[PDB]
Amino acid sequence: NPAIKRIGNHITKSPEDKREYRGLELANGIKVLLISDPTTDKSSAALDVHIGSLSDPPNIAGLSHFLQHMLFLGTKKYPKENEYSQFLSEHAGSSNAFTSGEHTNYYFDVSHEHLEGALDRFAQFFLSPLFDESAKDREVNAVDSEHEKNVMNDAWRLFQLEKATGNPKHPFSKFGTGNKYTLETRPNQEGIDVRQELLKFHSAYYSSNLMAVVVLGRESLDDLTNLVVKLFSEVENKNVPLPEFPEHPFQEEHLKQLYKIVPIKDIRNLYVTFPIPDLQKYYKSNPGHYLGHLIGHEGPGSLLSELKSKGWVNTLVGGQKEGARGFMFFIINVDLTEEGLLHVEDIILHMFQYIQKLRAEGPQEWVFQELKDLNAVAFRFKDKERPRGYTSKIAGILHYYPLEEVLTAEYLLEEFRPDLIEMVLDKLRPENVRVAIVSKSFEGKTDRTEEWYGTQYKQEAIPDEVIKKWQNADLNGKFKLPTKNEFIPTNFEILPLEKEATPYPALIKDTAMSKLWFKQDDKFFLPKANLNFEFFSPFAYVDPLHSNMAYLYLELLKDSLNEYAYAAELAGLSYDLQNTIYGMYLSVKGYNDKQPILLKKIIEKMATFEIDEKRFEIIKEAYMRSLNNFRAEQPHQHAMYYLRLLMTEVAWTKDELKEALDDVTLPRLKAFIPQLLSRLHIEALLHGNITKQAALGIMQMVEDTLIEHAHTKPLLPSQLVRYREVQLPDRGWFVYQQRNEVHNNSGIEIYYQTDMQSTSENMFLELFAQIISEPAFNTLRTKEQLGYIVFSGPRRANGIQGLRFIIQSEKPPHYLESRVEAFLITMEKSIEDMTEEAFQKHIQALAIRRLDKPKKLSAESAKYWGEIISQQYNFDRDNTEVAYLKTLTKEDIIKFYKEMLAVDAPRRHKVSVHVLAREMDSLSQAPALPQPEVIQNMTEFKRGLPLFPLVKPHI
């Protein structure tokens, strides 16, 4: 009651938003946002502490992150560490947390009926945490797992490297994650009791005055107010001043510097950075957004367009980048072609020529107005967010914007401040640059090493003569400001729900050329539509060469349409175009208004587009590198890849694709395109703000454009062949072994093939998967410490299914095999032993997950598209399958496990892929395992086995 310092005024929201909001500040300094949503299926809450890794002690790197893991381990009210995670698990809930440089964000979701119980357990960690000593070692191992994961990742390596080259005394040089060495090895050597320093950091930093709470529930604003005051007013206020970092981590000696970096993957990238003051305070005018929009533009006359025309770069990212409170960066990042790598100096001069063109032309009010207008449309028609992510996001935002501006924060622009644009543009000068080149061409030509990741690099000062050349850049006529964006939507009319509107997609067209599935949106009522097209051709995957040609065609087509499509993308109209094992896939999403205009341009271009020889050669080289770069992918990813090659009727390997790539000539590709488009079948899903007639009109326009320009004729029904899954023999065990040449970790996929999909088979497998899910994580990951990646669940491909296990470990694959088999026995035991009440809780947990309602149109369309791409067309699956699930007995699951999964099962169909670590050589009692049949040749393996039938559709 007097526990409230102030209640905010109206929380500005979209007129389309039916959720109710209340902003307030508690007497202890906690900033609060309450969200009342009577329709919500899940309730949520988040707390964001404005303290992170930048506040870590110099002697303990990763302490803030360690505290994040340690904070949620029992309280005075709820002593058991498992209490919070167990309560959420029992009430269809989840939780997670993240530590950044200036924040530690904690969040959960729970069933709408259990918000008070979940929130009470959550609030206790900010009142009386116990920090349970029992879990210390495991958490250190969980922080060490997260770091060891990122070590071989090129992006994280680059992230730490930038921190290592600036002012060494600056908190920005800190290693924020931590690992075993920083949280255990070094403090033990140095005589640091980690527990007392953790407790000390918590006492010094965890103050209510630096905390922000967001709560979303079914309950009214008043009921939510009372509950938050009840649970959060007791949080201790220590009046901790908010840490600021006003000195830029890059001083005069850190400027006009050049870095030459060796990557893990075969990538060529150029990173251009300028230190800038913190622009956060200027958010109402956002001059960095204005400059990022122009420098990062991809339309005609853009910086990117000229760099592409010159054959130096393929992609560009430009704009402002966060630092911390007090410092920021302005970046211009490009990828490089082979020629671009030899013209780094010319690329930079071109970047400065474009910057100087912005100075010469001066700020543009019309550009600012367009950005403001698009942001207003984006805010008004924003998709409804999933509660968990929505509370977490707002909890962070509460620290930067007044209560009333919490939702409009990242959207609304108000005043045009040309002076501020000019101020920022004055910093984008050669005397203020930092340049980094990432290339394998630097291997063995570097003298320095970054300590955290092992990144090899060289530092050089940029010559004064190079700086002078950049300063004296002659004006380039190729650079022009963008023109008026003609894709800005204006028609937001929501068409009335038709008399014959359906709850699921209906087949409205069934011809030799096309199958058309349509549903007018009856849930979201936003002026948007999703238009999905699957184009089928036997010539898209007939051999590796054709598969390569299908890929290059679509990449060149997207490259050619880029300048035009970018304006549409800025205006909330996006598309995706990709090749498949059956043909092509096209998706058009966003505002329905200019949607037929973009679709028409894509179909026309598909059928009559010009191939630029220079682009062809550049895209072909990039595709070759992309294929090789798969060697640097994670061992578990490799395991999953080999199993797909093994189990599918036709599948071309990365090696067969790269070998056939050299035979792709420009004349061969020019003949391929009319061949591919000559005969097609189109299957579509048109879902959103559209009528039945408008849907038919869109499909007809796609057909007519292809018929006109490509002389498209339909395929015969006998030509519409889908690939089958390999039928494994009863009691058989096959193993396929390979080695990852990059990572020193093992990868494994174990697949227990069951049978063809059916209502019963799906539910037996899904309920077994539900039951084993939590124990698999608790046993294999938590207890046994097998590895970071421990996964179990149903595997579905080509109408067939089974149980799979995916594990990435430092331990050999043969050992992971015995541990999984050991676990299956423990699970057989666990089902025999479990109470009917515990069993019925598994049925209910599964039923809730299956009936989980899409919060946005794309999530609904994706569910319908899944039914279409599998040719099962079971749109009412969730209801029918849940109804069957509820009839299932504990005995039914025991019977199923005994026939299909048990080590001694008569119908056990086991296939394992073993991916060895780089250096690798070629507890519950584990059962006796048979000798596996080692697969030497994938072709002979497939030839020697039958192929399953394909699933009968739902008519």
Ligand X SMILES: C[Se]CC[C@H](N)C(=O)N[C@H](C(=O)Nc1ccc(C)cc1)C1CCCCC1
In whole angstroms, give the CA distance from residue 10 to residue 22.
8
298 binds, among a copy of itself, Zn ion, ligand X, none (CB under 5 to 8 A by kind): ligand X
In the stretch 923-942, what mask flags binding to a copy of itself with x, by CB under 8 A?
Answer: --------------xxx---
3-state secondary structure of 324: strand
Helix (H, G, I), strand (E, B) or coil at 941: helix
Half-sphere exposure of 676 (CA within 13 A, CB side): 29
Instruction: Name which position in 282, 327, 642, 652 contacts a copy of itself (CB under 8 A).
Output: 652
What is each CA distance from 952 to 566, 715, 802, 879, in whole angstroms? 42, 21, 18, 20
CB 527 within 8 A of CB 711: no
Assess 310 for contact with ligand X (CB under 6 A): no
Determine if 384 is a binding residue for ligand X (CB under 6 A): no
3-state class (DSSP) for residue 912: strand
Distance CA 299, CA 581 (A): 32
Binding residue (CB under 8 A) for a copy of itself from 7, 461, 542, 934: 542
Judged by beta carbon, residue 691 or residue 871, the one nearer a copy of itself is 871
User: Which of the listed partners (ligand X, a copy of itself, Zn ion, none) does 542 bind, with a CB threshold of 5 to 8 Å by partner kind?
Assistant: a copy of itself
**For 654, what's the count of Cα atoms within 13 Å in the CB-facing half-sphere?**
14
Contact (CB, 8 A) for 87 and 122: no
| Helix count and strand count (H, E) for the chain | 30, 27
**Interaction mask 251-290, ligand X, x per CB under 6 A:** --------------------------------------x-
339 binds a copy of itself (CB under 8 A): no
Nearer to ligand X among residue 293 and residue 350 (C-beta): 293
- The minimum distance between CB 412 and ligand X, in angstroms, equals 14
By the rule CB under 8 A, 679 interacts with a copy of itself = yes
Stretch that binds a copy of itself, among 4-12, 151-159, 695-703, 713-721 (CB under 8 A): 713-721
Provide, rounded to whole angstroms, the least separation between the CB of residue 297 and ligand X.
7
Which amino acid type is present at position 632?
A
Site for a copy of itself in 755-784 (CB under 8 A): none
Binding residues for ligand X restricted to 475-514, rule: CB under 6 A:
none
Single out the segment in contact with a copy of itself by CB under 8 A; choices: 423-431, 711-719, 761-769, 928-936.
Answer: 711-719
656 makes contact with a copy of itself (CB under 8 A):
yes
Residue least distant from ligand X (Cβ)? 296
Asked whether the beta carbons of 839 and 934 are under 8 A apart, the reply is no
Type and span of the H or E element at 523: none
Residue 933, SS3 per DSSP:
strand
Q: Cα separation of 573 and 589, whole Å?
A: 6
Rounded distance, CA 204 to CA 209, Å?
12
CB closer to ligand X, 333 vs 705: 333
Among 724, 842, 855, 910, binds a copy of itself (CB under 8 A): 724
Q: Report CA-CA distances (Å) from 592 to 17, 209, 475, 566, 572.
A: 20, 46, 41, 17, 10
Residue 720 vs 934, nearer CB to a copy of itself: 720
Which structure tokens are listed for 15?
């007129």
**Contacts for 374 with CB less than 8 Å, ≥ 6 apart:** 485, 488, 570, 571, 572
Residues 138-197 close enough to bind Zn ion by CB under 5 A: 146
Does residue 663 belong to the site contacting a copy of itself (CB under 8 A)?
A: yes
Give the closest residue to 453 by CA, choosing from 101, 179, 785.
Answer: 179
Residue 42 in the binding site for a copy of itself (CB under 8 A): no
| Residue 543's binding partner out of a copy of itself, Zn ion, ligand X, none, with CB under 5 to 8 Å set by partner kind | a copy of itself
Lookup: tokens for 483: 């023109």
- Across the beta sheet with 20-26, what order do the strands follow? 4-7, 20-26, 31-36, 211-217, 42-49, 104-111, 94-99
Q: What is the 3-state secondary structure (H, E, C) of 252-295?
A: HHHCCEEEEECCCCCCCEEEEEEEECCCHHHCCCCHHHHHHHHH
The item of a copy of itself, ligand X, Zn ion, none sharing an interface with residue 938, based on CB under 5 to 8 Å by kind, is a copy of itself
CA–CA distance, 236 with 239 (Å, rounded to integer): 9
Q: Which is nearer to ligand X, 211 or 561 (CB)?
A: 561
947: which DSSP letter? Answer: B
- Binding of ligand X at residue 722 (CB under 6 A)? no
Residue range at the interface with a copy of itself (CB under 8 A); choices 99-107, 536-544, 577-585, 784-792: 536-544
Q: Tell me whether residue 167 or residue 727 sits nearer to a copy of itself (CB atom).
A: 727
Among 386, 382, 687, CA closest to 522: 687
Among 170, 293, 343, 877, indicate the residue that binds ligand X (CB under 6 A): 293
Regarding 376 and contact with ligand X (CB under 6 A), the answer is no
Whole-number minimum distance, CB 327 to ligand X, in Å?
Answer: 14
- By CB under 6 A, residue 292 contacts ligand X: yes
d(CA 128, CA 117) in angstroms, rounded, equals 17
C-alpha span between 47 and 125 (Å, rounded) = 11
Instruction: Between 393 and 908, name the residue whose CB sits nearer to ligand X.
Output: 393
The answer to whether residue 412 forms part of the interface with ligand X (CB under 6 A) is no
* Residues belonging to the chain: 955
Cβ of residue 178: shortest distance to Zn ion, in angstroms? 9
Q: Look at residues 27, 48, 23 and name the one whose alpha carbon lies nearest to residue 35.
A: 23
Tell me which of 93, 263, 299, 318 binds ligand X, using CB under 6 A: 318
Q: What one-letter code names the amino acid at 276?
A: I
Cβ distance to Zn ion smaller for residue 146 or 345: 146
Q: Find the residue with minimal CB distance to Zn ion.
A: 146
* 371 vs 951 by CB, closer to ligand X: 371
298 in contact with ligand X (CB under 6 A):
yes
Task: List the single partner that 321 binds among a copy of itself, ligand X, Zn ion, none, CB under 5 to 8 Å by kind.
Answer: ligand X
Instruction: Answer with the entry of a copy of itself, Zn ion, ligand X, none that 248 interacts with (C-beta below 5 to 8 A by kind).
Output: none
Using CB under 6 A as the binding rule, whether residue 430 contacts ligand X is answered as: no
Which chain residues interact with ligand X by CB under 6 A? 289, 292-293, 296, 298, 316-319, 321, 331
Which chain residues interact with a copy of itself by CB under 8 A? 538-539, 542-544, 652, 656, 663, 671, 679, 713, 716-720, 722, 724, 727, 937-939, 943-950, 952
